[PDB]
């Protein structure tokens, strides 16, 4: 199914019932009106980071179901699957073949060896300090080959995740074939996880390295264009990097909206949110919640330092069942572990207003499954796992879902989503206005049709208006 200008669900393969068969039942039985698309988070066999250390793209991890189950969901909903362009599991056949056969491995060129990458008398202390690091150490792990020789391989994230070398014909063949395989399982979008990390180059920070990153993105886009599949480069960065990707014609994520909407609702102010809604790229995937925590670095310069501090303290002070310790190292964590609904104090009025803003914001709205069901902080699972992120990764039963559908806030959110999916106005052009300091008007116009949101951020009341003029 081709991408449409309709809400996309974000879910785990096993978070809505048990597996992909349950996911398909929940979509067809409850969600046909309210989502046109589904982002299934990585469902390949993985050796860590719940899907983000994949071993093999050519199979569905057996507990979730099969590729056939994914294909049936693709027939009714436009689908987004993940490709990890930056790295693959140490538990992959590809890496295990490299450790065994070394120079005789057909997969040796998929990985970046320290001995091969650094010229003589390098790296210097400066070389290592220049690298944008996500941990305290240089981004390398030791390996021992079968033949007893030793080296280091580039490793950006966890020791489960070995970086691919996108400079080599071997990596290009792996990526090309995987993108072709994913194209053939019905994807309308491919999300490129951590794509900004994929370029390693001497005398650079190895982060969003120009011009090579444009070569890499265009090369992938070229492979998918022939199937009318969209490439979605995923980055959590300053909004100027989103603007630069959008300039090269790609869709981007709006990871700024979540904190801009929290700040607007806590402060009762429309100014910062109206600025972003006017200036943001028109081709984007908007978010309040994702599978991850609420991102604060993403809203840098779109709120002042004091506005960010006020918003983070409002979340902890007004949030429903949220503690500072849940986003500390005690729970394995700048991102805040909190459901969006619990971030607004489980306030139905403020939450619906947040979702109405999201529906009217430039882009395709993405609705994380926990937010779909106005999910509150899962303290039970958080304590069971000690994963801070789990506060916002509740596992719903089919029975639990049937009960969530009876909440007025959930029924009201479904009506909002159906309206955003059905109303021609959203396929037109958008006009943003503010009156005084607390009011926000968003008008979509498409020919004889106009859709309007009038929101008072101070009293959290709002009006939705649709008209068809026939003259």
Which residue matches tokens 């330092």? 305
Resolution attained, angstroms: 2.0
Stretch (H or E) spanning 313: helix 305-318
**Residue 192 marked in a binding site:** yes
Question: Which technique was the structure solved with, according to the deposited record?
Answer: X-ray
Torsion angle defined by CA atoms of residues 211, 213, 216 and 221, in that order, rounded to the nearest 10 degrees? -100
CA angle 233, 257, 443 (to 5 degrees): 105
Residue 175 vs residues 86, 180, 224: alpha-carbon distances, Å: 10, 8, 12
Between CA 233 and CA 252 the distance in angstroms is 6
Give me 188's structure tokens: 């309308």
For residue 7, count other CB atoms closer than 10 A to its CB: 24
Q: How many residues does the chain have?
A: 471
Q: Which residues is 286 bridged to in the sheet?
A: 254, 365
CA angle 120, 126, 127 (to 5 degrees): 50
Between CA 437 and CA 458 the distance in angstroms is 9
Torsion angle defined by CA atoms of residues 321, 52, 295 and 313, in that order, rounded to the nearest 10 degrees? 30
Q: Cβ distance 21 to 48 under 8 Å?
A: no
> Is residue 234 flagged as an active site residue?
yes
> Is residue 412 flagged as an active site residue?
no
**Residue 273 marked in a binding site:** no
**Residue 335 marked in a binding site:** yes
**Residue 134 marked in a binding site:** no
Of 160, 193, 237, 298, which is the active-site residue?
193
The H-assigned helical ranges of 319-464 are: 340-343, 348-360, 369-372, 379-385, 398-404, 408-422
**Residue 471 marked in a binding site:** no
Q: Which residues is 466 bridged to in the sheet?
A: 451
Of 6, 109, 163, 234, which is the active-site residue?
234
CA count, 13 A, side-chain hemisphere, 104:
5
Between CA 187 and CA 194 the distance in angstroms is 19
């Amino acid at each position: 199914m081709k991408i449409k200008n309709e809400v996309m669900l974000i879910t785990y393969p096993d978070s809505l019932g048990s597996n992909l068969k349950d996911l398909k039942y929940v979509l067809e039985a409850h969600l046909k009106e309210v989502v046109g698309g589904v982002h299934i988070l990585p469902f390949y066999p993985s050796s860590g980071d719940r899907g983000f250390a994949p071993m093999d793209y050519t199979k569905v991890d057996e507990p979730f179901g099969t590729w056939e189950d994914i294909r049936e969901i693709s027939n009714e909903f436009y689908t987004m699957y993940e490709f990890m362009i930056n790295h693959i599991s140490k538990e992959s056949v590809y890496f295990k073949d490299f450790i065994e056969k070394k120079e005789e491995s057909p997969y040796k060129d998929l990985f970046i060896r320290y001995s091969d990458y650094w010229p003589e008398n390098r790296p210097t202390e400066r070389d290592i300090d220049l690298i944008y690091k996500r941990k305290d150490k240089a981004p390398f792990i030791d390996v021992t080959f079968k033949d007893g020789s030793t080296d280091q391989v580039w490793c950006t994230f966890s020791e489960e995740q070995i970086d691919l070398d996108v400079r080599t014909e071997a990596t290009r063949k792996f990526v090309r074939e995987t993108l072709e395989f994913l194209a053939q399982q019905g994807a309308s979008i491919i999300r490129l996880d951590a794509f900004a990390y994929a370029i390693k180059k001497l005398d650079t920070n190895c982060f969003f390295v120009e011009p090579e990153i444009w070569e890499l993105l265009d090369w992938c886009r070229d492979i998918l264009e022939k199937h009318e599949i969209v490439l979605l480069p995923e980055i959590h960065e300053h909004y100027t990097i989103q603007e630069k990707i959008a300039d090269k014609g790609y869709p981007v994520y709006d990871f700024a909206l979540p904190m801009l909407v929290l700040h607007a609702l806590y402060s009762g102010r429309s100014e910062r949110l109206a600025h972003w809604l006017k200036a943001c790229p028109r081709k984007q995937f908007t978010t309040l919640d994702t599978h991850d925590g609420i991102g604060v670095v993403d809203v840098k310069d779109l709120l002042t330092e004091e506005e960010v501090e006020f918003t983070v303290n409002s979340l902890y002070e007004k949030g429903a069942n949220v503690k500072r310790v849940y986003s500390s190292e005690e729970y394995n964590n700048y991102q805040i572990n909190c459901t969006y609904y619990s971030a607004l104090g489980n306030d139905d009025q403020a939450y619906l207003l947040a979702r109405a803003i999201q529906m009217f914001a430039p882009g395709i709205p993405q609705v994380y499954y926990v937010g779909l069901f106005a999910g509150e902080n899962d303290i039970e699972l958080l304590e069971q796992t000690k994963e801070g992120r789990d506060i916002n990764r509740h596992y719903y039963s089919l029975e639990e879902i049937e009960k969530e559908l009876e909440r007025p806030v959930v029924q009201e959110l479904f009506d909002l989503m159906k309206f955003r999916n059905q109303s021609k106005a959203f396929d037109g052009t958008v006009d943003v206005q503010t009156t005084f300091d607390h009011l926000l008007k968003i008008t979509w116009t498409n020919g004889d049709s106009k859709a309007v949101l009038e929101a008072n951020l101070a009293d959290k009341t709002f009006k939705i208006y649709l008209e068809h003029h026939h003259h």
